[PDB]
Structure 1
Amino acid sequence: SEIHVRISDFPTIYSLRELRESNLSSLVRVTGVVTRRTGVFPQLKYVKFNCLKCGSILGPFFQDSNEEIRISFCTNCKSKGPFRVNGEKTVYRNYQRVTLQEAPGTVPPGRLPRHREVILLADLVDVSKPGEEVEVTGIYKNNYDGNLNAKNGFPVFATIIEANSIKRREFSWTEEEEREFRKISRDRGIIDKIISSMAPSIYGHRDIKTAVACSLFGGVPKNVNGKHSIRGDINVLLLGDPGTAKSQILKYVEKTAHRAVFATGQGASAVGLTASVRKDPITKEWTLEGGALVLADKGVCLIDEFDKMNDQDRTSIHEAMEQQSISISKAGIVTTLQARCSIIAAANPNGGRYNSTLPLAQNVSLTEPILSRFDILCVVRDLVDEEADERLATFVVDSHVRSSPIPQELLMKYIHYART
């Protein structure tokens, strides 16, 4: 018996720290990085009173997000027979407070990102996940209270906002979309335009992209009653070449992938590459997290040049691909974390363009057993060839002239539609 529209793009396109009382009470779409949040709680929704002296049910009152007053004199009489809520006939709803800081990539230099409260009601609640890059269309207000008896000087109601809508970083299929979209699928040669739509601006190896096409497309686990589901995700590996587009491609997959996370090698890109979290009740509740792959589950892993990685984090490397569930010893809290991610790897060969004609075990310091978890090895080349760059440099120059493949929306929907 209820619905509300999320609607659509409403610039704004304002960030965080830029907002004003001019923006208050009027809906403002806003951007920010998802942060820690409370668990979903029941909301008072519609108030009602079994009261005291005056009789039940008295009928429900509409409150509140969030005020609910004042019930002075009523329902019989007045008081002391005064209004009080009862569990019966009282509608409720899900509620979640959330923290979302402004995006560090959008963070002005040397200035600390600002914290922002994130309100959640109805369907919007719990749909968000912490650490996500996200957009929100809210309404900025002085809301609420104001006491805050601490301030006082200068007297203010601490600002809070609930976005009508939320969107992950930064699309879904529909009938009329998928239906003709199904008609695309019937062709067999579609496989090629999948290479054609693979990385059209990249050119590159049709072969290297083939392996790209493979793990990128995903697959069934598949479960074995009542035991292991084996591994439905591809662990992708790339033997690099200096000067080659290799580092660039996974980045294509980045905006390509519905769910994607790239921590690169180490030093270390986000984040710790593993779950370090210990609580700490106190303080205030602390926060718990897993490895980098925890951020995206069923989403493919993105990493490059493990050679620059520390061996400690590199243990989780072979670790993640193995059990397909994350685990660590710190500290008192005990669980079993299950994360399933396709895993991409591209690392540059030791030394020169090609390490040795001798077997890649000679090529790489990395152990075969840890490499063993890699089903696909992407090896590249080559020594200079005459026409080779004519086939590319001419391609490349024409690429930069800007200033066949499926539209990425279709192809990106294609896989997600498939994985779903």
Structure 2
Amino acid sequence: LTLESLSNVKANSYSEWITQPNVSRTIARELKSFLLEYTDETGRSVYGARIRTLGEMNSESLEVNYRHLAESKAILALFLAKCPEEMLKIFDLVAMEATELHYPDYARIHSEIHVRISDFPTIYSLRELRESNLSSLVRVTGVVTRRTGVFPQLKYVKFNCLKCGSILGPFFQDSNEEIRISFCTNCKSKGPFRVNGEKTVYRNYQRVTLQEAPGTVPPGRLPRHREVILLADLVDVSKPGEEVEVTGIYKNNYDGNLNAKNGFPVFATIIEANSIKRRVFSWTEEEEREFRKISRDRGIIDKIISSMAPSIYGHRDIKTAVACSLFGGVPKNVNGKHSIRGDINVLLLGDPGTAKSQILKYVEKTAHRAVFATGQGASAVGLTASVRKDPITKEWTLEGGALVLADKGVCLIDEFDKMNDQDRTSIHEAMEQQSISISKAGIVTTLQARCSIIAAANPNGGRYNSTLPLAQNVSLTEPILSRFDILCVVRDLVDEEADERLATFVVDSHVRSHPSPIPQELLMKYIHYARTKIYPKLHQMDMDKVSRVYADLRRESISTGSFPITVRHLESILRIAESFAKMRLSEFVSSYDLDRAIKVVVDSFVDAQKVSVRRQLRRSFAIY
């Protein structure tokens, strides 16, 4: 037949038209012509180059564009819309033959090529679907709410004859109903027959639940949902919580026995998938020499310190601390008998309305391994380890808190002052020993909790009391406070000039939202490379200065009658110097980095003190 001949159907329906041998041969030949005769604007072989990159990675799936097939040959597009199931087998055999025609012996490295249609005009919401859409090609949006594991499905099945012990050859599984045999060719029997698990070849299977995105739902109504089945290379692509675009076929579950089941005869529906798309920190040798180049510009430190929370006004000290705790340091083991941690903890104590949660939000978008938990609220993760039951699989699971789940990363605790006793015990253990212990339901174990803590809290009453020390404004205890390196105090001092700029910035935000800076994308990757390969050094020519600095700050602290100074302050000094040095991708901690570090600790100590002590110290420590 010819192409304009096919567009006069001479059968009861499309399905019976497509299955006739003469029309199948025609469409197979015309698909070969489409594969090997396309040309872009310039004329490049759009599918030729795709079929040669098929060879290199050796993939088993091919991408086709509906726009091109509508451009060339329209009856094929109509049949693809109406009866895709029959079309896709024919189209997949054509692709496999064409690939072999350009890569010989690829039928061994892979035995079947899958076609996935990329673009398609009509896009539906889950609530619009009706019974006129059954057995048709559809494209939908939604959000992924649940996910199952990977189960194997039968592809090439071998049977045993339990009288003459023979293995009957490959039989194909259609993904509709289970296949059963009835005749043994060697002994001529219809006896018992069982599937040979060892000689069978299987396929990947997974199921997902799609929900209407909350934003689009018209007022007053509720979101609808549907189920999606993914086969082979599509398993484990979209993790729960993301928005996806699905191209597939709309089908009925042939439930079971329609007998019994008294009541109206209703049926259930599913979607069988063809393509999924979404609607990183790995780097390359192109960007490595750009890293090194930016590292040679004097003053990379102040660029980084102004590339942090790029939408909160002022608060330079907290941004410096954020950078320090977002780069890190070097963990240490002295001959397997002494450990000094590497991460630097940061506490925020501030009055209501100073944008602490905004910085905590930024840290989570900027970091690799960051987790969020709340003290007094509703969060998807707690702080205590436990053994609970899985609602879906009905299994017992071991779950750790955010502290365990955020190993070698950062943990973000919001509303740090409203914890119950259990959460406080967990936090203390994690910060002190850096490992979580559990003895529940026969499980005795210790887990690793090498994590960085950033926390936010509100004083007692609601406002800061400058006439008393830090320990008497907040409900936390000295054991916990002493385990933090840097303490930041945000004070709502009524100053006339500052309000001008604060209100200006805030009003500009609303006005603009009506219906130095390094780019964030490069900073994200620079942070990972630096923390992966940069372990700066401490050559001891520079020991004389710090000995005498510590001596002076110890002699002054006891004289003034305030907090004691212990060696944890010097350890913090060195650990922060490591971070300032690592900022410059450096090779030997400089004295400039040490001097920059000294300010942070001295300022923290001076600013966390009573008014009288603070006036004494702010004059005594003027040189550092």
TM bracket (short chain): 0.7 to 0.9
Deviations 1:384-416 (A, max 9, x none): 334334454444444445235233333334434
Partners of 1:22 and 1:178 lie apart in 2 by 56
Deviations 1:16-38 (A, max 9, x none): 77766677667777777776766
How far has the Cα of 1:307 moved from its partner? 1.9
| 1:252–1:25 distance in 2 versus 1, CA, 3 Å | farther
| 1:47–1:236 distance in 2 versus 1, CA, 3 Å | farther
Partners of 2:446 and 2:258 lie apart in 1 by 41
Partners of 2:115 and 2:334 lie apart in 1 by 42
| 1:322–1:72 distance in 2 versus 1, CA, 3 Å | farther
How far has the Cα of 1:259 moved from its partner? 4.3
Relative to structure 2, which stretch is displaced further, 342-351 or 400-409? Answer: 400-409
Checking the alignment, whether the CA contact within 8 Å between 1:101 and 1:113 is kept in structure 2 is yes
Partners of 2:229 and 2:267 lie apart in 1 by 16
SS of the residue corresponding to residue 178 of structure 1 reads helix
Partners of 2:433 and 2:121 lie apart in 1 by 45
Relative to structure 2, which stretch is displaced further, 44-53 or 110-119? Answer: 110-119
Checking the alignment, whether the CA contact within 8 Å between 2:367 and 2:524 is kept in structure 1 is yes
Question: Which residue, out of 92, 97, 106, partners 2:202?
Answer: 92
Partners of 1:290 and 1:41 lie apart in 2 by 26
SS of the residue corresponding to residue 84 of structure 1 reads strand
Deviations 1:337-393 (A, max 9, x none): 445543220112223542334431123220121223323322223523343344544
| 1:363–1:148 distance in 2 versus 1, CA, 3 Å | farther
How far has the Cα of 1:121 moved from its partner? 5.4
| 1:117–1:235 distance in 2 versus 1, CA, 3 Å | farther
How far has the Cα of 1:418 moved from its partner? 5.0
Relative to structure 2, which stretch is displaced further, 143-152 or 102-111? Answer: 102-111
Relative to structure 2, which stretch is displaced further, 141-150 or 350-359? Answer: 141-150
Deviations 1:33-90 (A, max 9, x none): 7767665444434433455678866543343657442434476687527864334443
Checking the alignment, whether the CA contact within 8 Å between 1:361 and 1:367 is kept in structure 2 is yes
Partners of 1:172 and 1:22 lie apart in 2 by 46
Relative to structure 2, which stretch is displaced further, 354-363 or 139-148? Answer: 139-148
Structure in which a larger fraction of residues adopt strand? 2
Checking the alignment, whether the CA contact within 8 Å between 1:239 and 1:348 is kept in structure 2 is yes
The reply on whether 1:419 has 2:500 as its aligned counterpart is no
Relative to structure 2, which stretch is displaced further, 282-291 or 235-244? Answer: 282-291
Checking the alignment, whether the CA contact within 8 Å between 2:281 and 2:528 is kept in structure 1 is no
Partners of 1:75 and 1:4 lie apart in 2 by 33
SS of the residue corresponding to residue 114 of structure 2 reads coil
Map of 1:6-405 to 2, 5 A cutoff?
Answer: 40-49=150-159, 58-63=168-173, 65=175, 67-73=177-183, 79-80=189-190, 84-92=194-202, 95=205, 125=235, 141-143=251-253, 145-146=255-256, 154-155=264-265, 158-160=268-270, 173=283, 176=286, 180=290, 183-185=293-295, 187-217=297-327, 231-279=341-389, 284-285=394-395, 289-293=399-403, 296-403=406-513, 404-405=516-517
- TM normalised by structure 2 equals 0.52
How far has the Cα of 1:209 moved from its partner? 0.9
Partners of 1:229 and 1:62 lie apart in 2 by 60
SS of the residue corresponding to residue 204 of structure 2 reads strand
| 1:143–1:183 distance in 2 versus 1, CA, 3 Å | farther
Relative to structure 2, which stretch is displaced further, 378-387 or 55-64? Answer: 55-64
Relative to structure 2, which stretch is displaced further, 223-232 or 368-377? Answer: 223-232
| 1:341–1:79 distance in 2 versus 1, CA, 3 Å | farther
SS of the residue corresponding to residue 220 of structure 1 reads coil
How far has the Cα of 1:238 moved from its partner? 0.7
| Structure 1: runs of 5+ lacking an equivalent | none
Checking the alignment, whether the CA contact within 8 Å between 2:258 and 2:265 is kept in structure 1 is no
How far has the Cα of 1:306 moved from its partner? 1.8
| 1:6–1:224 distance in 2 versus 1, CA, 3 Å | farther
Relative to structure 2, which stretch is displaced further, 243-252 or 108-117? Answer: 108-117
SS of the residue corresponding to residue 273 of structure 2 reads coil
Count of residues in Structure 1 that have an aligned counterpart in Structure 2: 420
Deviations 1:106-138 (A, max 9, x none): 999999987866756556656777788988877
Checking the alignment, whether the CA contact within 8 Å between 1:46 and 1:92 is kept in structure 2 is yes
Partners of 1:149 and 1:183 lie apart in 2 by 75
Partners of 2:141 and 2:342 lie apart in 1 by 35
Checking the alignment, whether the CA contact within 8 Å between 1:143 and 1:158 is kept in structure 2 is yes
Partners of 1:210 and 1:338 lie apart in 2 by 28
Partners of 2:246 and 2:405 lie apart in 1 by 20
| 1:186–1:272 distance in 2 versus 1, CA, 3 Å | same
SS of the residue corresponding to residue 139 of structure 2 reads strand
Partners of 2:245 and 2:531 lie apart in 1 by 25
How far has the Cα of 1:198 moved from its partner? 1.0
Partners of 1:108 and 1:385 lie apart in 2 by 46
| 1:317–1:48 distance in 2 versus 1, CA, 3 Å | same
SS of the residue corresponding to residue 493 of structure 2 reads coil
Partners of 1:196 and 1:335 lie apart in 2 by 43
Deviations 1:271-296 (A, max 9, x none): 44324544599994366533244565
Checking the alignment, whether the CA contact within 8 Å between 1:131 and 1:295 is kept in structure 2 is no
Partners of 1:83 and 1:381 lie apart in 2 by 80
How far has the Cα of 1:302 moved from its partner? 1.8
Checking the alignment, whether the CA contact within 8 Å between 1:279 and 1:333 is kept in structure 2 is no
Checking the alignment, whether the CA contact within 8 Å between 1:236 and 1:343 is kept in structure 2 is yes
Checking the alignment, whether the CA contact within 8 Å between 1:278 and 1:331 is kept in structure 2 is no
- TM normalised by structure 1 equals 0.72
| 1:150–1:317 distance in 2 versus 1, CA, 3 Å | farther
Checking the alignment, whether the CA contact within 8 Å between 1:142 and 1:157 is kept in structure 2 is yes
Checking the alignment, whether the CA contact within 8 Å between 2:331 and 2:339 is kept in structure 1 is yes
Deviations 1:323-347 (A, max 9, x none): 4444445545555444554322011
Relative to structure 2, which stretch is displaced further, 368-377 or 116-125? Answer: 116-125
Partners of 1:328 and 1:103 lie apart in 2 by 39
Partners of 2:218 and 2:334 lie apart in 1 by 51
Checking the alignment, whether the CA contact within 8 Å between 2:137 and 2:250 is kept in structure 1 is yes
Relative to structure 2, which stretch is displaced further, 112-121 or 394-403? Answer: 112-121
| Structure 2: runs of 5+ lacking an equivalent | 1-110, 533-624
Checking the alignment, whether the CA contact within 8 Å between 2:309 and 2:362 is kept in structure 1 is yes
| 1:203–1:147 distance in 2 versus 1, CA, 3 Å | farther
| 1:409–1:367 distance in 2 versus 1, CA, 3 Å | same
Checking the alignment, whether the CA contact within 8 Å between 2:281 and 2:524 is kept in structure 1 is no
Structure number with the bigger relative contact order (C-alpha 8 A, sep ≥ 6) is 1
Partners of 2:507 and 2:154 lie apart in 1 by 63
Checking the alignment, whether the CA contact within 8 Å between 1:54 and 1:82 is kept in structure 2 is no
Partners of 2:254 and 2:282 lie apart in 1 by 36
Partners of 1:130 and 1:59 lie apart in 2 by 40
Rg bigger for which structure?
2
Partners of 2:467 and 2:339 lie apart in 1 by 38
